[PDB]
Amino acid sequence: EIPKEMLRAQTNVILLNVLKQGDNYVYGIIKQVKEASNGEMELNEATLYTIFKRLEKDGIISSYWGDGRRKYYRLTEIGHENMRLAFESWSRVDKIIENLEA
Amino acid sequence: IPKEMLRAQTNVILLNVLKQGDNYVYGIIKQVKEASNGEMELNEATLYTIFKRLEKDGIISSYWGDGRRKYYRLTEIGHENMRLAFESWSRVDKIIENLEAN
Ligand SMILES: COc1cccc2c1C(=O)c1c(O)c3c(c(O)c1C2=O)C[C@@](O)(C(C)=O)C[C@@H]3O[C@H]1C[C@H](N)[C@H](O)[C@H](C)O1
């Protein structure tokens, strides 16, 4: 079994990395992820929009419009910084664990 | 760093400790302190809080071994969950790298 809180986290990481590659709109994101996952992850629009409201509510991402009009989502600098801390944070965890194996 | 994220990390480390072998609270705090070379000094209360949840979820059990000490064990479900979870997160790493090919 896997904690649902944990799959929700993974999906967040993947999404944030997509915007890290560059700004994008929802349909392009699921497509990009569906491809990169070779088909195992078909994200549903409804739950995905639900997640993006939280991130914008956290200022981690912003949104805007551009044409063929589509609403694009941007990785904010605050989002950029948080991702750095998180990866650096999680990097220390991997080191803690490796030491434990001694 | 999200406090939510530190609790997850703290959970991962503790479980990886018990994967090394059954242990008691002060032994676990010591092992983590050493493995982090002093950067993570967990207080007794936080482990009890976390272990109460894990014991209730069947992820760990406890037992008295001797000079009395309360030992904590990672159950079979816990091992499987750690296995499944680590497999899970490994899949994410590929999805992301594929995104960079994209
Ligand atoms: C891109 O880095 C991240 C950025 C933000 C959040 C995260 C992560 C992240 O990498 C991450 C994980 O790698 C892992 C987890 C996680 O929550 C995050 C993030 O939240 C959860 C996990 O600890 C389990 C088993 O629950 C396993 C996994 O670590 C992997 C690699 C470790 N070296 C260790 O072997 C562990 C058991 O599995």
Author numbering:
A (entry chain B): 3 to 69, 74 to 108
B (entry chain A): 4 to 69, 74 to 109
Published text:
LmrR is a transcriptional repressor regulating the expression of the multidrug ABC transporter LmrCD. In the apo state, LmrR shows high affinity for the promotor region of LmrRCD. This affinity is reduced upon binding of a drug at its drug-binding site, enabling expression of the multidrug transporter. LmrR is a homodimeric protein with the drug binding site at the dimer interface.19 Central in this binding site are two Trp residues, W96 and W96′ (residue 96 from the other monomer), oriented face-to-face at 7 Å from each other.
To investigate the importance of π–π interactions for drug binding, the electron density in the π electron cloud of W96 was modulated by progressive fluorination of the W96 indole side chain. To assess whether the Trp analogs influence the overall structure of LmrR and its drug-binding pocket, crystal structures were determined of LmrR with bound Dau for LmrR variants 5FW, 5,6diFW, and 5,6,7triFW. The crystal structures belong to the same crystal form (space group C2 with very similar unit cell dimensions) and were refined to resolutions varying between 2.55 and 2.15 Å. Although the crystal structures show generally good geometry, they all suffer from high crystallographic B-factors (average B-factors for protein atoms varying between ∼57 and ∼89 Å2), indicative of static disorder in the crystals. Nevertheless, the electron density maps were of sufficient quality to identify the Trp analogs at positions 67 and 96 in both polypeptide chains of the dimeric LmrR variants. No major differences were observed in the backbone and side chain conformations around residues W67 and W96, compared to wild-type LmrR.19 Moreover, as shown in Figures 2 and S6, the binding mode of Dau to LmrR is not substantially affected by the presence of the fluorinated Trp analogs. Dau is bound in the same way as in the wild-type protein, with the aromatic part of Dau sandwiched between two Trp analog residues, stabilized by π–π stacking interactions. Thus, we conclude that the different Dau binding affinities observed for the LmrR variants are not related to conformational changes of the protein or significantly altered ligand binding modes. The binding affinities of LmrR for Dau and RBF decreased upon increasing degrees of fluorination of W96. Dau behaved less extreme, with the kd decreasing 6-fold.
